[PDB]
Amino acid sequence: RVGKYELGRTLGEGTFAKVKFARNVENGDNVAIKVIDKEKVLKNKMIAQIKREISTMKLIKHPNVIRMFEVMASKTKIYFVLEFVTGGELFDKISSNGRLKEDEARKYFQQLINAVDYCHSRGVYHRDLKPENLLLDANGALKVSDFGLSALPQQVREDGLLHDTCGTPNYVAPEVINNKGYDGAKADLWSCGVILFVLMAGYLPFEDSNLTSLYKKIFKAEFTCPPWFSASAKKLIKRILDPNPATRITFAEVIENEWFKKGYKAPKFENADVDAIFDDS
Template sequence: MAPEERCAALHGKYELGRLLGHGTFAKVYHARNVQNGKNVAIKVVGKEKVIKVGMMEQIKREISIMKMVKNMNIVELHEVMASKTKIYFAMEYVKGGELFAKIAKGRLREDVARGYFQQLISAIDFCHSRGVYHRDLKPENLLLDDAGNLKVTDFGLSAFTDHLRQDGLLHTTCGTPAYVAPEVIGKKGYDGSKADIWSCGVILYVLLAGFLPFQDENIMAMYKKIYRGDFKCPPWFSSESRKLIMKMLEPNPNSRITASKIMDSSWFKKSVPKTLRHREEEEEFGLASEKVKEVETMNAFHIISLSEGFDLSPLFEEKKRDEKDQMRFATTRSASSVISKLEEVAKTRNFSVKKSDSSVRLQGQEIGRKGKLGIAADIFAITNSFVVVEVNKASGDTLEYNQFCSKELRPALKDIVWTTTK
């Protein structure tokens, strides 16, 4: 690695090691966090290259998505750093390598394949519940940790619900040919969740068979097989697994099985790991998303990003600056002082208020262009005397939210917002 690259990547925090892999636009290195000794993977992306080919929006999207999808079966993004020439992803280090390496040695036993498949569907269903579609699912993008747990990686081709066109469908043709759904090839628009389910069906077939369901040296001939759903299951497939794969590799996306139906199938339910069962129970009773929230802490990266001179927000935002639905500021006042200030603002507009020690929810009573305006403010304690507040639009129209922030909220908070002399 070049000295400039090594110095920039460290930022006083990471000690870079051997090269783990590389692609057209990125290199991935093993690294060690010098503060806690933990292993991480550092993905290094050259800005010049991605800008030259118009991929900066894709990089921003990948960062945004990885910040959204925190799940035990998805590779975690710890933080993002940037220099003038590079972008650095500090990610969870997954020691066991690609699932593809296991398949390359031959097909897996049905119980082993089911274990990996259960974790895959759990991760993908989690993504879909947050409006994220992977769009490039294949064994090469499924990693295994040293305990044998599956981790989905490489969200570079992923899409948000926000990327749907007016017809409610995605229209970008992407993915790996042998794993791509027929409707994606058709270029008439597709549902991202249904296309991901098709890819999961191909992966399950490969796990159990040791080879692909759709194969041909001529790619157009292979596409024709995919269009028709022209494949055969080997005789060693159990009847239950065969039925499930047939439902997943259904060429008509409207008739294709859903993730919830897959998880409800008898084949899937056999020996569901305790970790998955526990998470399903939490979600059923609302525990996973509604846990009591204490005043949280933020790292130095977040503090630096508050300074205009170190503003890395373009790496995380898809929207233009005049379309923001988030505002962040710092203050040396206490969390209770911030809450009191927000309550004062709410009274002037007759907003209802719900509050805890670390959050305030303001709900408007008037119906605007897109319903009632809702504001969410989350308070993060950096130290006892330094607090960061994130204000987001929870509901309603973005333009009305921005007008409220600029004309009422910002002026009302002016005397408590932390500023530095430049």
């Protein structure tokens, strides 16, 4: 046993991190418990940011963000307890049934933008948003995974789980491909825009069998919207997928956008020590 949590099967076991299924004995909620090497994260250059973002994600409750229930530590380990959802991955709808209708795409896009924008407002940037982070609960609501956790060092992100993405480079903004540092908000917004493209088209905007030509297209944002895209959706997508992060549209501008505001009901919800986030207890 571990905490108020009863353990189930091992989901993955990487070298410095591992993930177990569990349930909360007090309420029966499904969770996953990630156990990671403590010194690997303590030694890391960006530890103060890690501590800050993780401490923040503990506090955040947004209806469209995966909950981080607990964060505890041993002398050698850090434990994370994360909400486990049962509706699968959002992109499964495309694998099984092709592109989504515009209204269903816009709905998920609204949940996504609001959740991402909310985390940004609390100083937390994903920086590696991929379709595999777009999960669905029993009722079909979007739950975005890995905010905060994505800030951990690579060797601890290798946690024994299968992580592949169809069309990986598509979701990474040109400035993230090419540069060491970058703006987190603009990098996340690029990812969201590609996600929206795929939901509405059923296929990736950037492709080429030739890798040099593929990355050339990404850096110029050379892509083509299919004919079923509306004029207003195409125009918003082209502003989001601006290959220059200096001129790329802002989240605030996306939220004010006429296409975006269609059927848009901002969700009503409420959300009302850092250095000691990983010490023993």
